[PDB]
Amino acid sequence: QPEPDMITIFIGTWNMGNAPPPKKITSWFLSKGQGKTRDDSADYIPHDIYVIGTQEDPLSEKEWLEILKHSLQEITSVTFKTVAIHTLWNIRIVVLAKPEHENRISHICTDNVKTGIANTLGNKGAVGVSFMFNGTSLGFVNSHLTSGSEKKLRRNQNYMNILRFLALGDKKLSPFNITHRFTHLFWFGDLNYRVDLPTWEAETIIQKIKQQQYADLLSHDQLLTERREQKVFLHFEEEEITFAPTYRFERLTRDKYAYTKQKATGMKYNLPSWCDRVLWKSYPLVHVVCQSYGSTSDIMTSDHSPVFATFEAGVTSQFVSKNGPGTVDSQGQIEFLRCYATLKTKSQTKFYLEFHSSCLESFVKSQEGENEEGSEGELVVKFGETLPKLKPIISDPEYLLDQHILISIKSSDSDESYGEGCIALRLEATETQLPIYTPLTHHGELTGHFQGEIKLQTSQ
Numbered sequence: 001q002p003e004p005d006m007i008t009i010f011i012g013t014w015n016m017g018n019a020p021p022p023k024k025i026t027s028w029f030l031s032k033g034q035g036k037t038r039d040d041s042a043d044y045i046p047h048d049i050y051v052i053g054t055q056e057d058p059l060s061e062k063e064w065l066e067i068l069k070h071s072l073q074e075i076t077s078v079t080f081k082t083v084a085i086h087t088l089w090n091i092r093i094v095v096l097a098k099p100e101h102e103n104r105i106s107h108i109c110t111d112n113v114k115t116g117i118a119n120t121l122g123n124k125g126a127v128g129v130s131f132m133f134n135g136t137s138l139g140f141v142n143s144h145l146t147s148g149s150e151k152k153l154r155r156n157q158n159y160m161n162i163l164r165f166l167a168l169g170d171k172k173l174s175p176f177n178i179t180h181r182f183t184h185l186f187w188f189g190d191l192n193y194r195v196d197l198p199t200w201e202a203e204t205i206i207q208k209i210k211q212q213q214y215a216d217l218l219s220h221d222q223l224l225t226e227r228r229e230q231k232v233f234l235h236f237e238e239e240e241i242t243f244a245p246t247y248r249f250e251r252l253t254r255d256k257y258a259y260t261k262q263k264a265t266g267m268k269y270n271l272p273s274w275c276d277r278v279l280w281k282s283y284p285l286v287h288v289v290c291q292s293y294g295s296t297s298d299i300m301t302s303d304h305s306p307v308f309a310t311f312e313a314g315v316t317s318q319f320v321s322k323n324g325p326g327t328v329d330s331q332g333q334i335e336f337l338r339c340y341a342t343l344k345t346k347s348q349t350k351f352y353l354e355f356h357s358s359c360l361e362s363f364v365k366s367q368e369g370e371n372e373e374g375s376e377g378e379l380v381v382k383f384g385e386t387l388p389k390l391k392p393i394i395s396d397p398e399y400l401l402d403q404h405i406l407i408s409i410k411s412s413d414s415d416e417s418y419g420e421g422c423i424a425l426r427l428e429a430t431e432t433q434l435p436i437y438t439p440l441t442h443h444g445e446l447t448g449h450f451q452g453e454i455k456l457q458t459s460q
């Protein structure tokens, strides 16, 4: 039975509005309704992994697992295994997988982060799951961020707290937050970003939605504008939105947006918005293709419509050679030449690098680099040809070319990371000096750049 090189992943996000679901929700798992939908000819084909994020979920874990498992069984005739389930208040993530994947899945982690302080600590935050699928690390984050058209900054703050404090993936990757720990990271939820147009334009917005004319609305979507200004979700992707706003509907129909201020809304307008979103971030040069991104039309128990997204995702096998794992393979080496970090920091400490990768027995500390002044005020840390030669566990190019090196630049004074990034070993050539590059982030904010050249030796 051959190990897969590709899997399909279903991501669902639904704010249930504290109401039980209707008896049939199969349209969600089938990617049917509005937007980029799945072909009818695929309806009996199960996804490998289903990740279900809910918000304002009134159900017990047991109640929701029974609905989900019985829904997928009806669609696919397959009885899914429960990988993980985690609930913070009314925020829930469920991971289900086809039975053939049970013994490919290991290192399951779950966590939550509560956002806000005092007043604003009460019901918003995130849940997450991570695990290994053969040689591939997968992370999933379901977040319910701060509500309200006038709180986009609060939402960006919630995002930064979630990505700093959510403890998923390999704890040995200690300088790295969840935005560097996974081959593929999926971040979805009721992110609560609004269409930022005047209240007086509500009926105009509804008109535009009825004509399926979204361009002038999406140009005012707070998540798209905040992302474009690098305020939030830096280095994340999102598929083009081609479905109507998923909030705020009158319940029991989809014919009406309920946007007017009411006691129940704290006298706030809820102009039609794309609250409910799916984004991802994969390591460089790993296959990831969005095959669907849309909303259901036929599930009307909530004031939100469910959103679906499906992905093809590249995965690798567990790899065993004569040598590694358990030793190095002297026919392999990674050399970094003429490397320098450019940092936005105004500080003056020395810096060194750490290299982390599952292709190494353990992480490698470099010598301190040489600080120079950049021509436009910047700190440039020069490593030259001084960086340690990295000794991979396996030299076979079918393994090594699929790997990644995580880089942290750390202060000699504090040992705190000032920047994190990732270099793919999927090179155009081996035994050849080739340019490499990664932006560097810390707490998911741009702090600089790492660039230079790499020379990769494999057994071929």
Ligand SMILES: CC(C)(CO)NC(=O)c1cccc(Cl)c1
Pocket (backbone or CB within 6 Å): 081, 082, 083, 084, 085, 097, 101, 102, 103, 105, 106, 108
């Ligand atoms: C018992 C739970 C629900 C805990 O998260 N699931 C597992 O432990 C598990 C482990 C390996 C593979 C798979 Cl499919 C599930």
